[PDB]
Design a binder for this molecule. Structure first.
Ligand code: 3O3
Ligand code: 3O3
Ligand code: BR
Ligand code: BR
Ligand code: BR
Ligand code: BR
Ligand code: BR
Ligand code: BR
Lengths: 264, 264
């Protein structure tokens, strides 16, 4: 085979590689064009899922794919870091938060997930992998009226996220510093696994130990050409669970959301 | 994992075990309820492709999958043979043809394919693997006004398919007895490969030698839970071609249709 996307992807990866050579520290404003070139490929609706695997998972794409995925992770993290601090400093913190590049996507994504998980006001939710900008946790309370624990493994990132929540005046959102294993000590009706929470295999094995067969578990993944952004959760990762629902994204939304329940 | 469909599949397969190595001896009328049981699962739109893959790829499912596929291919062949002979003997051949159990699905399948392959009246189509009831060839002319050569490897089957075409009074449909390599001496705009055309490896490697990069090639395969019916075309099979489009079936249609082009 002979996909025209292969050359386009390799050239983007070459640009990323040259950039990384010069700077470890991401220039978030400067790389927005690169992100948009990548998302135009990711959002190409003409490409079916099987074809996406044929193009993205080809052996000769491995190196380029790894560069693009690392870029997406590092950019997303830096954008979150920068926005968190902006929110904390702002006299108009909600207006500041809504300016986050990806903000409207979260509204659409969470709508999807709330239907999939049958979210109800007052239910307890745990979100594993809050990051510096705990937007999903914030929305689960602010929009869905859930009582939320957000879990974050890096103590300084956890601290930042707490200041963001305090800055916005959002109630019902607590941040727990620790790994996924903290769920042993929490009551919850629904558990969500962040798109970038890693390592997947470990996270799901630990989840399996601590949840029961009634716990609604939603995880975020990448399918079709959106897999250019990040490695999907594999079926091996979710051994001991059964899939019970999936929402495929459209528009600009990147994540696929999967509902699973612990067997048996 | 713990899908309800696992046991349901195993149960159906247990009732096929005693027919193993002798499915060709089946009473087609008598086994229709079995096909319905299998299709109940195959056609269940709540089973996502990841779940279907989990079930169907499991080593413990291999024997059951083999039984179901043998049943399906033998029932399909026998239904086709019986119908071909009925049509040839009928005073009302088109009415007889339209009573074929799968007839409505062919209309939908072809409708999807016509859009995918951008079929235009008067275009020249070659169909590899007519079988005794060359319904696709018949409809390509009758519905889409294409000029058709159907290719059939077995002389006796070729003779039967000619009699069906002639019985119906269909114009612009000819049967060529030979292997796939007969396309060397043909001039055509669209090439189609039947769902049951085998061996895929040899067939596609031969196709690659004769077509050019402009030839629209459509092949039929099985995806998701419908792969319970018949082995999907493997990635190995279509090496040297690029995928350009797909139609995934809905309702009762079994086949996925794939548009490919020879590289580059
Ligand atoms: N931050 C969220 C992920 C939210 N994804 C959104 C925003 C855009 C993106 O992440 O590429 C989406 O899918 O469109 C998490 O940690 O799960
Ligand atoms: N006979 C055709 C296949 C026609 N498939 C139809 C009929 C049902 C079936 O084959 O199970 C379909 O997908 O619904 C061929 O060999 O290409
Ligand atoms: Br504000
Ligand atoms: Br988040
Ligand atoms: Br199930
Ligand atoms: Br039975
Ligand atoms: Br057999
Ligand atoms: Br046919």
């Amino acid at each position: 085979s002979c996909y025209i996307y292969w050359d386009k992807i390799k050239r983007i990866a070459s640009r990323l590689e040259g950039m990384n050579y010069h700077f470890d520290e991401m220039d978030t404003s400067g790389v927005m064009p690169l992100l948009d070139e990548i998302e135009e490929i990711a959002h190409d609706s003409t490409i079916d899922f099987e074809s996406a695997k044929h193009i993205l998972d080809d052996a000769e794409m491995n190196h380029a794919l790894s560069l693009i995925r690392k870029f997406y992770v590092n950019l997303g993290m830096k954008l979150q870091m920068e926005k968190a601090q902006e929110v904390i400093e702002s006299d108009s913190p909600w207006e500041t938060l809504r300016s986050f590049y990806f903000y409207p996507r979260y509204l659409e994504l969470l709508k999807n997930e709330a239907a999939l998980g049958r979210f109800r006001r007052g239910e307890r939710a745990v979100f594993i992998g809050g990051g510096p900008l705990p937007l999903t946790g914030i929305l689960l309370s602010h929009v869905y009226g859930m009582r939320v624990n957000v879990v974050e493994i890096e103590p300084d990132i956890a601290e930042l996220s707490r200041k963001v929540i305090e800055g916005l005046g959002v109630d019902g959102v607590n941040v727990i510093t620790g790994d996924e294993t903290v769920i042993d000590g929490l009551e919850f009706d629904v558990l969500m696994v962040a798109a970038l929470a890693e390592p997947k295999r470990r996270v799901f094995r630990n989840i399996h130990r601590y949840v029961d067969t009634e716990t609604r578990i939603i995880y975020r993944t990448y399918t079709g050409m959106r897999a250019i952004l990040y490695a999907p959760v594999s079926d091996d990762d979710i051994t001991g669970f059964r899939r019970a629902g999936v929402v495929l994204p459209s528009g600009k939304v990147n994540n696929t959301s999967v509902l699973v329940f612990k067997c048996p």
